[PDB]
Design a protein around this ligand. Sequence first.
Ligand SMILES: Nc1ncnc2c1ncn2[C@@H]1O[C@H](COP(=O)(O)OP(=O)(O)OP(=O)(O)O)[C@@H](O)[C@H]1O
Ligand SMILES: Nc1ncnc2c1ncn2[C@@H]1O[C@H](COP(=O)(O)OP(=O)(O)OP(=O)(O)O)[C@@H](O)[C@H]1O
Ligand SMILES: Nc1ncnc2c1ncn2[C@@H]1O[C@H](COP(=O)(O)OP(=O)(O)O)[C@@H](O)[C@H]1O
Ligand SMILES: [Mg+2]
Ligand SMILES: [Mg+2]
Ligand SMILES: [Mg+2]
Ligand SMILES: [Mg+2]
Ligand SMILES: [Mg+2]
Lengths: 246, 385, 109, 390, 143, 244, 240
Amino acid sequence: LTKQIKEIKEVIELPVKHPELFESLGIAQPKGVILYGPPGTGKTLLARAVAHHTDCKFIRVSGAELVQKYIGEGSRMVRELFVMAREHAPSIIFMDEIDSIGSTRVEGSGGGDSEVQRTMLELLNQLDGFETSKNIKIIMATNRLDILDPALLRPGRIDRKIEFPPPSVAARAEILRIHSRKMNLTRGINLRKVAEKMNGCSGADVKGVCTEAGMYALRERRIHVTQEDFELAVGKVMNKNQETAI
Amino acid sequence: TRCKLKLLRMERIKDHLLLEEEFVSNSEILKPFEKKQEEEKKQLEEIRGNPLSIGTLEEIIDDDHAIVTSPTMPDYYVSILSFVDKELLEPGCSVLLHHKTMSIVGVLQDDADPMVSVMKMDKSPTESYSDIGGLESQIQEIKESVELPLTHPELYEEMGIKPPKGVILYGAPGTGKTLLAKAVANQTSATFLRIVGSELIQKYLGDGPRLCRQIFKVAGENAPSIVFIDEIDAIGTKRYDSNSGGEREIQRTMLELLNQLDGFDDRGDVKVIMATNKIETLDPALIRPGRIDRKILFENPDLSTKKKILGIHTSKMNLSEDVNLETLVTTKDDLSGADIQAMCTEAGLLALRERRMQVTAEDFKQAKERVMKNKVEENLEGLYL
Amino acid sequence: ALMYGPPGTGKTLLARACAAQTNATFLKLAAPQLVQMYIGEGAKLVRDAFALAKEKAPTIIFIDELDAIGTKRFDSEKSGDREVQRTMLELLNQLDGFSSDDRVKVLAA
Amino acid sequence: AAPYAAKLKQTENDLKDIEARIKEKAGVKESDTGLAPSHLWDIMGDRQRLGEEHPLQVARCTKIIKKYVINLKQIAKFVVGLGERVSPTDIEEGMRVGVDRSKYNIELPLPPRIDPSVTMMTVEEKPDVTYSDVGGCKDQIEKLREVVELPLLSPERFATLGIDPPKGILLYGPPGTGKTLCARAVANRTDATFIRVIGSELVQKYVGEGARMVRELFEMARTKKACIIFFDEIDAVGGARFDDGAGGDNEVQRTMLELITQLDGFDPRGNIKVMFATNRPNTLDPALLRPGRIDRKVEFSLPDLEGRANIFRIHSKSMSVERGIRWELISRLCPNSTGAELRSVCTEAGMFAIRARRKVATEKDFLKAVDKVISGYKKFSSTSRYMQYN
Amino acid sequence: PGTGKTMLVKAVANSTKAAFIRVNGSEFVHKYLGEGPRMVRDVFRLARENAPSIIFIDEVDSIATKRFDAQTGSDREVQRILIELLTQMDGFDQSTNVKVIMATNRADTLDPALLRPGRLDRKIEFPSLRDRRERRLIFGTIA
Amino acid sequence: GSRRYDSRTTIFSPEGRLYQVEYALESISHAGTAIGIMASDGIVLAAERKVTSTLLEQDTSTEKLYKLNDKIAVAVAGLTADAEILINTARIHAQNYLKTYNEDIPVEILVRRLSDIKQGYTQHGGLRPFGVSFIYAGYDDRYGYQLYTSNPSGNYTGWKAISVGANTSAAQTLLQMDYKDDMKVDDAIELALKTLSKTTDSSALTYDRLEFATIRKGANDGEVYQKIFKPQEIKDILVKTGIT
Amino acid sequence: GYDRALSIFSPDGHIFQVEYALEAVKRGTCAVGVKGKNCVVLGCERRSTLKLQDTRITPSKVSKIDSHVVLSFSGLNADSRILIEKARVEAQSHRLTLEDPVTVEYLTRYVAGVQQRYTQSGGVRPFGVSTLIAGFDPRDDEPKLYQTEPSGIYSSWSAQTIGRNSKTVREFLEKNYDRKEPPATVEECVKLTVRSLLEVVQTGAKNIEITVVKPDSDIVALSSEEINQYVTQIEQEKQE
Ligand SMILES: Nc1ncnc2c1ncn2[C@@H]1O[C@H](COP(=O)(O)OP(=O)(O)OP(=O)(O)O)[C@@H](O)[C@H]1O
Ligand SMILES: Nc1ncnc2c1ncn2[C@@H]1O[C@H](COP(=O)(O)OP(=O)(O)OP(=O)(O)O)[C@@H](O)[C@H]1O
Ligand SMILES: Nc1ncnc2c1ncn2[C@@H]1O[C@H](COP(=O)(O)OP(=O)(O)O)[C@@H](O)[C@H]1O
Ligand SMILES: [Mg+2]
Ligand SMILES: [Mg+2]
Ligand SMILES: [Mg+2]
Ligand SMILES: [Mg+2]
Ligand SMILES: [Mg+2]
């Protein structure tokens, strides 16, 4: 997903690296950046990547109240996260609508995970004296944009909307190679021909072809990941995905 | 400059001199400090020593005795000794105990809480009144209720009329319900507590009233105060389904908010701002005129008003001479002031992708067109004509 | 015996007459006091009440408003309380015969 | 420049040295008093530290054995004797007692109850909204006085007939009719301890804890001498019972059932009058309503035309108004209204006078205000929906 | 419930010829104090000592619950047991030890802090559905 | 009795609006897009289907274009089920007028008649309103070519080019910049396809997912021939105008 | 049948379906009526937000009931046509049986009586329309101008306005219309009605429609050019 790296660099990376470009023009700071697409197309992976390059803290909040033991609660927490965020800033608060664990919160509210997004966005438009330039951005992830209620799509509320298409046959080849660099190869293997044959739909699936190829390496006690292993792997991964997805 | 330094120089060496005179001639007289003073501080410290055990005063008995609870389990019928204000000790208060034989040797404790800090805004918004382009009439219904009785409490007391209490800022989205709250919160320099209406639904049962009783107690202590409740619409309309008390729970919490707002308490000075976008949903008991006094209403900015709004966002901006402000106003026909702000922000972003400081005429025309498509008309007044 | 009917006909009154006239031991109990928020402290109270009733035998236990030990009809997978439930089922084992139910009569209203 | 840049440093050292003199005189460490009566208190605390009035470890009795069975808080039980301070007549069942630090012996009986820390917070300091402020000379005021005020004021007159006085009043009516206003008025008048509880605060987190709170409230009242407990806004905790079959009203009615049972007891309960104020009687359960727990229903309803004339006089008498105000004229022009709209009327009459730069409110200004209040807020009238639940 | 989760683990206890430590999920709840943390700390050390070793918690479900009140004492004591397990699960890395193998017949209530990567990784499925071939195979061995 | 179960689909709201007619507008915003363009010498009706799988035989299928007589065609956007009902009441009223005056029905009568049927259900009856919106393209000698849209309120107004269905706003703004009054039937076709090409959800635009029908005066003797295109004329006209 | 009692009294003594009906008339476009010495002039707001909309074939806001009675309206456009159908019917029915065209006051009494009927019939919601019925009685030149409303009550006015921003227009007509002396002629009256409208339309020559009705069955609509001319004059007059 090469195009998407360039669009989120604009709104997130640049106002941290240069708070002067945004003062000079007279442009308001960007706040929210909403990421949406099919799971596995890597909307989280890009998030971790931008945080590392700018050099900001990455605070993942899942909506769970269990992990909170120092405050005690995530029940009345909104600003109580920000108190901890302001000590360790610059920060990127991350929130993901999982809608498969905690599916009963989504109901009847445009996301019960969006209660977290809107309340935290409200404190962030006007807080303290970070009106000159803010050191906390806010990033929201949703499988689908359908769920988000209109009070998060108004003009001026977010600032950027990233879309992630499922990978093309060209993209699959690149993504399959990043996972193959970690493990052995054999001369003559065309990682391109295995991406085409694999219909697929996700990059999560693609990573499972590599791990499954390593499983076929153990049973025969090979010394190298060979061309036969990928053909068996593609099948095992595709058949398991089609029985659960249909 | 000249005279302010000159008078300070005389006052600050005259202060020096008087403090030296009081110190020398109250140390040679034993009836004031001297002999009692150098023995009480050393004795008080030494006798009780350390560790001082913190506990909680469970309740106080009128006879200078108390029942205090150590976290280590043993309760104690203690006595209340030297160097403590006995009116300051009340249920809930934390006390310091003398560890050899348990007696309250005092409370030195601020007892600062994250419960008071969460309500509190350290606000310094760059917004002041007249960053609201026009809608001047509406500004001067809000200032007469909230700000003015703090500036001149003389006018209402001469007249003999009780100040108006409460306001509701409602209307179409984008008319600046939040932007007005920020203007009026900046001027007053009263304690401005902020609490979004969504927070009043939480998962546990019966916590809603405990949370609602807490907010107003911080405010009454900090008079004069403002309590802004942003989108109190949110509790009626939504159903987060985290709270397993269901709809019954939301109703019992609402009834708590009604009592804290007027009820029996007879609280101190607490103005309330209630922002909402849909006044229909709101329970009719809340809106009732007696708790709120004036219901301000807004409407969609006009074509003459939109010129004022645009002038505010285009002033900060750098422009070329090729831009024409007037052709950006007329094309849009009835579009709120939130969209005008985004139209400026979108243009400056296109010019920053091309990497030229100036925002030319073309960046404005591409931005304006993109913002009309993003909107969604209004099938409420389309039905009509 | 059970007493059921419209409020105000005097179910509580009638039990009060019986207490003063029979000069048997009369153990007043109220069904909401029995329910307790601690985990299983409400069960311990039922067994202690019937055990005291053996010593003072013969006895009458008059329970008021049995609606606080309500009805068992829940089985949801989301919450369900299941506290009131436990102390009600402890009450049934003392009404059973293992515990002598011939020294102890129960007036339910 | 230099003569004052160097002397500005000099005066900052001379002030830091003046802070040391002021710290030394009073000390200001372990201080929490005016440092004048605490000198004498210092010698008094030396005599109490030597005496063993304290510490006394606080315990509670579990069974009197004709000898006692005491339980300490650190959970370990003891059989104790008797103190030379006290008679055995004063040691009772369940009572809190202080025992020696060492060999545990009963010293002093203590007043009961450890829950008092929410319900003690609502023993009122009695505000004053005088009885004049109540509108007119209504019958409704006189039916409250026969319940609360008269049996405390003059028990001579009730003794002859032999009537035992009623106890319960139910105040009910559309919002803004002054249900609460009267409550505050009888709060000072009465002079008995006045405890107001909000109906939402009885709802607790745990199954069975809401029943405790309301149970100890009454126990405390019986100890005090003559009480009035004012249950405000008990729509919450009051809803008739149902069983959805899925969750039920189980946690709410656990509280509601405890309240019913101490207003008929299995015993006569103490001198306790109870006032209920709701915005809907619809909600309330048939067990709360019948006489003996809510003897007299009194309706606070919209005032008729003559009522609205007296309630204009009670808000306006502080106001400066001209002589030519015909309050009959603007009461006739005001339709059917609650007393809460009439406050906003007068506030807005005074409001238009401050905008106009006039010190005295005129006839023109009062008409504008009536127009503004009823026109706009007839759209937001609480009165129409809530009158139907009645 | 009832597909042969435990019975597949019995077989594995015989064949391995590596130490094997078998704990119910209720040995970790103590009644006194801090003893929950004290059970976890011992169990992982004991594995490392006689390595290579398999730890099996029959049912870990009550300890790995998803929701905590964090007011009642009981909950505040389970949180400590669950933090320790997560901490020493990453310490197990770079030993011959194979990590804890554990079963639960519930999957919705699990704490997702266990199923993050670097801790519990591989998820086994046991179906309820039986096709015709796989059914005959079970009948064959019992009969 | 019956009152408990009653929805009441005819009351006013607290603000002087009809909720139930508003909601009918909402369900029309999910259905497929339909566009009509008025040239000097004809009318283009072009509609995008909501179905697109290949098992479906879209070739003989018509669910968007209907002829009401031999001079007035309509396009549909909404519930296709509901729409067939109003079309037979229109077909019948179009014919009654030809029976009694021996003269083809004016476009103004046939549109005003359908509107009042829809109005009818929100006035009384307690039935749920209709969930349909029509574009009428028709020809009459009084005004030449005419175009009219009606919605579930019953309010209809004429247009030069209009669009109902998904992204009504977006489709209207693209047309507004390009449309000109000197357009011929060739020019209009090219603007209609291009505008559907920019709004379609799928980036690819195929001949099979488009329905298309015109009304041209190039039929001899001062007459008008309505043709609903075959799938082989659409295919050739998609390669001609360079959309693929 | 379907006969639910949709319209009932509330305890405040207003029917809530009728108050709701009258709020619906407020959001409507604005229509103004002013009667001169011997003409009436009906000025109406055209929603011009719309673009690419043909004005040749689009129904206007002034619909002739007879050849000397015109009717204008504010509110729901759809429901309005239902009154105008029963009105055109009533005008020919009265010509048939008594002879003589309808007098303006009678044609209102019928139309006002229909709006009243639909506030008692069970199963029917009230109308969301208020009208201005204007014109000249036959064989007379007294101008007449009436207003009905969804309560069913009707009144004659010297000038009136219904619809959105009506308070601002009505205030201008209470200062600029002398009750004793009408606009001298037909030309002065048009200049009084345009000048009232230009306060709330915030100009646009295309936005404003003017229909003048004169005695003796002379209905004419002022063309765009004429309107433009008047606006430019008033703007230039007022500007000067
Ligand atoms: N009347 C106005 N004048 C100038 N700027 C305005 C005006 N209204 C809105 N804005 C601009 O739009 C921004 C967002 O407005 P705001 O948050 O007040 O909208 P809102 O109406 O409160 O939305 P919501 O319906 O979500 O409450 C403001 O920060 C301000 O810059
Ligand atoms: N009978 C009255 N006479 C004078 N003033 C009144 C009267 N009734 C109400 N008011 C005024 O209205 C205000 C609000 O009334 P109050 O707080 O008693 O409401 P309430 O009757 O409790 O209704 P709710 O509880 O629904 O708000 C009072 O503070 C008082 O100023
Ligand atoms: N385009 C990609 N390039 C590289 N790795 C990918 C890509 N898409 C998916 N993956 C792999 O799949 C994993 C799961 O995706 P994740 O980042 O959790 O986001 P999401 O599950 O929301 O799509 C990634 O961590 C990564 O290892
Ligand atoms: Mg993700
Ligand atoms: Mg806002
Ligand atoms: Mg009874
Ligand atoms: Mg009240
Ligand atoms: Mg098992």
